[PDB]
Amino acid sequence: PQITLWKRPLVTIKIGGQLKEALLDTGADDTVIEEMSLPGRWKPKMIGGIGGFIKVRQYDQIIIEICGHKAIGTVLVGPTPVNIIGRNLLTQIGCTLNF
């Protein structure tokens, strides 16, 4: 699809058997999801943005389905106010910026 930017580019994602609403975020290096459980090993990580840093759990090799496109990558889990799909997964679904 072609998604305009008059409003937040929110899409439905499927992660760890759950459906969530997430933002397609070209300004985010990483994908950050609100608190949930995911299987496998994790390690703590600190990520910083507007308003400072938050502590997250880093899970690697996690499959997500984004608008019907499946991708795999690292997912960070922690107190983000909005679920964010960052560049590490946007590349995998072939998402580009065009003007």
Added chain:
Amino acid sequence: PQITLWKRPLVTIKIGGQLKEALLDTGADDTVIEEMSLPGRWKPKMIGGIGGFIKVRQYDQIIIEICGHKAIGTVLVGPTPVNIIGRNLLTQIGCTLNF
């Protein structure tokens, strides 16, 4: 152009005759630039970042060139890790997400 997302989508912008670097940021509602001098009156604005809420200075009707494209719109001045061009100006230059 078409900008892929394997690297950060950093571009040159021009504001007040000076070149700066900024991220094309679809996850940002607003455009947020690090402390600099802008003309005119400003008013207060609170934005909710990933790390929490911050107060910034809102300047309206600011002339800004982004990757060669002229925009005239709202710029917020405040502590951000990287200058970010948000949806308010991405729409002005005709930017869409595509996959």
